[PDB]
Amino acid sequence: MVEKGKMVKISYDGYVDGKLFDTTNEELAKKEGIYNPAMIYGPVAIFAGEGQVLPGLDEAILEMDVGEEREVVLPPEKAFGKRDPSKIKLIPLSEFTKRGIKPIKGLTITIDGIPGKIVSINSGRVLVDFNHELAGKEVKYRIKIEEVVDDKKNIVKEIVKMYVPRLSDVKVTIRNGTVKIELPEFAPFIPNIQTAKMAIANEILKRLEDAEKVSFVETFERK
Amino acid sequence: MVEKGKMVKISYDGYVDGKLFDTTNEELAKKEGIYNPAMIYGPVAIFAGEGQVLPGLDEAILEMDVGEEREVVLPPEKAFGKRDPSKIKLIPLSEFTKRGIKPIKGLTITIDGIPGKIVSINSGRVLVDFNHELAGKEVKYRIKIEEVVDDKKNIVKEIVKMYVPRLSDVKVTIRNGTVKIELPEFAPFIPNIQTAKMAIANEILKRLEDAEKVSFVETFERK
């Protein structure tokens, strides 16, 4: 059943048109010929049906129990999205050169956060499609609940890691409505750390109910 | 006598060629026709002869005692600097256009941190002088020791302020070799804060002897 909000270490196998596209197995990543030089592998810690992952796996994680695995089939409606017509627009040649780009069929461009694909350069105006690569297609998914965590101190720690990979270890210290985080002496030097902290905060609050204050204690010592 | 290292709230009147050039009196700033839209006025907290201010006032603060004032006269050797010949160099026209600037007599330019003044555009090469405006001249100074602070908790606080004006209030909490700084809830949002903190640290250590660890405790709460 897995209540809404309880942290789960899930692990996913993602197929589309038979070919595998997304997963958490690095050894399987080589053996399929796809690898992200940025993504972190192993059981991805997510929250119970809080809309963290795809809505289809989201409802499926709810149905599932700790340890249980299945071949979940996700319709495009409940997976990546049904291909919106209005998301196919014809953007002029100006708004194109205005971004230092010659319109090239196939080449993809971004307008206002939303990226998109040049379909055909119609002498004058350009046809661009703003739908996700995997929109409309149906995904065969294989998800397993690797473990569940339900002890505040630890939950916090996982969040911290979910946001800053480099932060494998930290002292948490719950004192009723407060969550003390004592970060390693290298922490204050992480590029864009304050941002993280103030995001790490959000989540700790947004999820952990017996928490109304988050604290980051940084230390400096001389050599 | 004022021992080396004890924090002092000094206040300065600075004359050069009769005209007043530097001071801590905002009301006198208008009444003389010079004002920095950035500088903060009132007794500037500095450390006892640690080379914080001009070496001349530095040795004079040592001679002086709390409350005492004088008309200290500073030679260019012990004030701003004696005008170095080698600091007058002839930089080529390339290194000039290479910085998007047409060489103009009077206009000042910077090369490698060190700013300097275009003296004469000698058809081909440019004569540039890299000496501080007030170098060579002699300064008439009027300095008064407004107060002295010698209690750790408080000393810390002044440093914090010396670095981040916005931080008028903070909880310090000395626990033997450690200095706990508890910063207001807006602190983590100050632009370039980590930098400050890690600088604030330095000083706290560099000065306060019974301190080997500095700590910054930031907090986040939701609205």
Curated annotation (Swiss-Prot), chains A, B:
Enzyme class: isomerase
Residue span(s) of domain PPIase FKBP-type: 5-92
Protein keywords: Chaperone, Isomerase, Rotamase
Superkingdom of the source species: Archaea
Any Pfam family the entry gives: FKBP26_IF
Keyword field contains Oxidoreductase: no
Region annotation (CTD) ranges: 151-223
Record GO terms (molecular function): peptidyl-prolyl cis-trans isomerase activity
GO cellular component: cytosol
Cited InterPro entries: FKBP26_C (IPR040825), FKBP26_IF (IPR054016), PPIase_dom_sf (IPR046357), PPIase_FKBP_dom (IPR001179), SlpA/SlyD-like_ins_sf (IPR048261)
The keyword Transcription appears for this protein: no
Catalyzed reactions per annotation: [protein]-peptidylproline (omega=180) = [protein]-peptidylproline (omega=0)
PROSITE patterns attached to this UniProt entry: FKBP_PPIASE
Any coiled-coil regions, as ranges: none
Cited function: Catalyzes the cis-trans isomerization of peptidyl prolyl bonds and accelerates protein folding. Also exhibits chaperone-like activity.
Subunit-structure text: Homodimer.
Similarity comment: family membership: Belongs to the FKBP-type PPIase family.
Protein name listed in UniProt: Long-type peptidyl-prolyl cis-trans isomerase
Record organism: Methanocaldococcus jannaschii (strain ATCC 43067 / DSM 2661 / JAL-1 / JCM 10045 / NBRC 100440) (Methanococcus jannaschii)
Native organism taxonomy: Archaea, Methanobacteriati, Methanobacteriota, Methanomada group, Methanococci
